[PDB]
From a paper:
AMP-activated protein kinase (AMPK) is a metabolic stress-sensing kinase responsible for regulating metabolism in response to energy supply and demand. The AMPK αβγ heterotrimer comprises a catalytic α-subunit associated with β and γ regulatory subunits. Adenine nucleotides (ATP, ADP and AMP) bind interchangeably to the γ subunit where three of the four cystathionine β-synthase (CBS) tandem-repeat sequences provide nucleotide-binding sites1. The α-regulatory subunit-interacting motif 2 (αRIM2)6 is required for sensing the adenine nucleotide bound state of the γ-subunit and transducing this signal to the α-catalytic domain, resulting in either stimulation (AMP) or inhibition (ATP) of AMPK activity.
The structure revealed two molecules of C2, bound within the solvent-accessible core of the γ-subunit. The phosphate groups of both C2 molecules overlap the phosphate binding sites of AMP in sites 1 and 4, while the 5-(5-hydroxyl-isoxazol-3-yl)-furan moieties occupy novel binding sites independent from the AMP-binding sites. One heterotrimer contained AMP bound at each of CBS sites 3 and 4 (white) whereas the other heterotrimer was devoid of AMP and fortuitously contained two molecules of C2 instead. In both sites the C2 molecule makes six protein-mediated hydrogen bond contacts, while C2 in γ-pSite-4 makes an additional π-stacking interaction with γ-His298. The largest structural difference between the C2 and AMP-bound heterotrimer is in the β-CBM and the N-lobe of the kinase domain, where a shift of up to 4.0 Å occurs. This shift reflects the formation of a canonical kinase salt bridge, formed between conserved residues α-Lys45 and α-Glu64, in the C2-bound heterotrimer. Strong electron density was observed for the α-RIM2 in the AMP-bound heterotrimer, but only very weak electron density was observed for α-RIM2 in the corresponding C2-bound heterotrimer and could therefore not be included in this model. Secondly, the position of C2 at γ-pSite-1 causes the side-chain guanidine group of γ-Arg70 to shift approximately 4 Å away from the AMP-bound conformation. In this new conformation, γ-Arg70 would clash with critical AMP-sensing residue α-Glu368 from the αRIM2.
Residue numbers in the entry:
A (entry chain A): 9 to 298, 321 to 344, 399 to 474, 532 to 550
B (entry chain E): 27 to 324
C (entry chain B): 78 to 172, 188 to 194, 200 to 269
Write the structure that this text describes.
Amino acid sequence: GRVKIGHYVLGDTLGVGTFGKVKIGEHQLTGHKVAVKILNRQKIRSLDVVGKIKREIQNLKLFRHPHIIKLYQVISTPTDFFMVMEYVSGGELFDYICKHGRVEEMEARRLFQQILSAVDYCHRHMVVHRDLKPENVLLDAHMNAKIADFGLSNMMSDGEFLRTSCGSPNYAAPEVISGRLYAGPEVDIWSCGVILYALLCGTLPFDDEHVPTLFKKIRGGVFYIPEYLNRSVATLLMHMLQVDPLKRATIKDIREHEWFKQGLPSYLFPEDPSYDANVIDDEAVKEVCEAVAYHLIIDNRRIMNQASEFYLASKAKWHLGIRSQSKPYDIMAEVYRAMKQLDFEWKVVNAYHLRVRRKNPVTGNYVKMSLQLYLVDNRSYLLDFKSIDDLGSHTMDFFEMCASLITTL
Amino acid sequence: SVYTSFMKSHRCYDLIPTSSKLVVFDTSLQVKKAFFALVTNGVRAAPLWDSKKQSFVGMLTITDFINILHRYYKSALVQIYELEEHKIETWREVYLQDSFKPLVCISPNASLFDAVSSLIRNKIHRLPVIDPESGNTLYILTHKRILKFLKLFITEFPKPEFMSKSLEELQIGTYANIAMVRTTTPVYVALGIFVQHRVSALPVVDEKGRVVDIYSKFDVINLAAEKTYNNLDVSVTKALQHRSHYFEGVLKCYLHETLETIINRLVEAEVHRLVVVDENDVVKGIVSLSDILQALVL
Amino acid sequence: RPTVFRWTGGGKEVYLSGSFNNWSKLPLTRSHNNFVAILDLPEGEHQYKFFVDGQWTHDPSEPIVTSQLGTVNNIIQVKKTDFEVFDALMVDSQKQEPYVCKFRAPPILPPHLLQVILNKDTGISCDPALLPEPNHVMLNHLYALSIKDGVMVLSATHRYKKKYVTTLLYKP
Ligand SMILES: CN[C@@H]1C[C@H]2O[C@@](C)([C@@H]1OC)n1c3c(c4ccccc41)[C@H]1CN[C@H](O)[C@H]1c1c-3n2c2ccccc12
Ligand SMILES: N#Cc1c(O)c2c(-c3ccc(-c4ccccc4O)cc3)csc2[nH]c1=O
Ligand SMILES: O=P(O)(O)c1ccc(-c2cc(O)on2)o1
Ligand SMILES: O=P(O)(O)c1ccc(-c2cc(O)on2)o1
């Protein structure tokens, strides 16, 4: 009524997410409705989430998709952070599944196509949601899916795994509940598989009152497939809800499935025909140097993308690092003494994780790599070698640093 | 005129595959191990890294294996001691004692026109793409990769008058003093012509007077693959016997045939050369990827 | 410009008196338990006090100042960096290699690293130098062959821009 922030009058609370409270914002002059997420400055600094909130704003500011909540502006005050974003009248997808009996295969497919398109956009921009559920998926007046709550989201790095257990237990992947390292996209596919089941069946595939009993069901990966569900959609759900993340389906696999292909619009995915004419590919950043120049880049990229055989492919066995059957304390003691002989400087991050460095005598530049000890099956350990990005050759300098370490060990 | 403007605008980066394999050899590595590694990995050439100098010195090709065999082979009874014991650095030492070689390379940011010019001018078939920022070798650029890339953009640009003209009228390729081999010619004799004449392939002719097969430089790695390198006294037909079963006939083109037909034939068959023929069956010359690329540059 | 004055405590009637006004009582709107009022204020220091249920009180979580008589009033910081989002997060963020060595087991090896790009079979109808699109998580990692006749073979997949290069080094 009286409370105003950037010409917007704050109304009733829409709900509370992972970080901060979300409230309705009606315009004082027009009456236009926006969603305002209030992040308390003291609450952020007390939880060491200053870096997480920074990445959250930076991503949403550059994120442009019709199935992801658009962030208009962010207002900073000396005590709070006001995130002004797109408002959707339809509410939660969870409420739609609860109000109706079961969402029909004609409408459930359309909603899933919109969800996966937004999920794929995140993954292509190196962002993994980690908290996908019908409660987090929103709906509008025109019945379109909208992705919200990027609080538990994280950035995907080259050669780096994620450990943080994020999301609801019913929607969490078997690797998430176990507390083990994962790549990222495979977790979102599992979560999307639960949403697809929830839309068609009306219930959850893994549901139990007892917490460890529920965890046992996810690890097992056994779920009921109803008689009203066709054979085509049944195979898709089984491939999406795989215990093994390697055997689990990908966005490219779902897009190629016969059930998903049905009535799929040509503007949702980048490889489709209508995408290049309706969606901006952000080529303006590369075409900023010196009107027809933009269309030249899009056409050249299309010819290169079409010829898959020209850029991509359709004896002794290789292995990652070095394997040892001895105790973890003995392996770590062996690596420290081997480095002193070669005159190396190392930064300690963890008991098994080491940030190592050396100086090249010919070029003069510093050579740095990251070491990490992993656990294989049982009683067997693996030492991992990973090159750090920041006259000679960077890749050759990394291979030589590894070669001297393996020989000394 | 039209294709010259295309190559000047497009960078070397556009040709590099999305996910490619690169084999690199250290100079201190034994030469025998290097040729065996080329077969197992399925690569035709590999850049050479000098550990002491901390820089890429050159390229190890099949020509190096041909040069070792012809210079050191004595008999099928006595083993080639130099091939068995020599390192890459030691082999290069005697090879560069006559004339040394500064590394010929292209930047990924440099235009495609400069890359084609660098291949024809230096008379080389393989050019390594090295990033000046990191110093890492990214991809080995060939004449085959450039022509296949240009074939993708033939519809995007308007076709000039020369593309609809016959090979006779254009006169592209070698038509005089073509180095050829007989069907009973031993491997050692054939290797000697590769060193003396500095050619890449030799057409095989029978006693009747007809081109039966073609003995190229790539056919030499089979001697290292099957470990039959120690006996170079054997005929050229016995050396080509490994791929003779799948073989139908060596690819040919006519003088009256248009330039567009010749370019399309080389990219589809994925071969490096075409035999020029008159009327029914008369050899006139050899047209290769290097001859076609030079015509689009000059 | 926009400054937030929120009352976390309970009550029915809450008023705000500060330095912005001549210590006058301003009515505050309530949602459920929180009493809030957003006012436009310039750069500098501003003193304020709350009036809950007919009695003067102060917020404990906010910094306080005491005068000569004994009146307790809150202190608010109005900075130029406080209004810009990227600048405000930078302020909140504000608030070496030893050569010496340093009982839980190490983490379980993920199955993604076991997927070797070189061991995977490729179709005969393509160039041998070509490889399938690698996972972003297998990049920079070192893969090696078993040592045979004093020669180590080392391999690692690296990204240049949008292209991936799988280099192999035969080093004795
Ligand atoms: C458990 N789910 C809730 C549902 C509810 O509040 C949350 C906390 C959750 O969503 C993730 N919230 C929603 C949105 C939001 C964004 C970021 C983080 C959490 C969020 C927005 C964005 N625009 C929407 O209109 C609006 C929408 C919201 N919620 C609503 C309830 C009714 C009508 C609209 C809303
Ligand atoms: N908890 C939560 C939370 C808030 O509600 C606010 C608010 C707020 C409180 C109440 C109201 C309100 C007041 C009267 C009527 C309706 C309202 O939504 C508006 C905004 C301002 S900063 C802030 N920070 C928070 O962490
Ligand atoms: O001049 P080179 O780059 O050393 C060279 C080595 C091998 C070949 C070759 C193979 C082949 O079928 O045609 N040419 O060319
Ligand atoms: O100078 P050329 O002998 O006419 C020539 C043309 C094309 C090639 C060639 C060799 C090769 O490995 O890939 N392409 O060699």
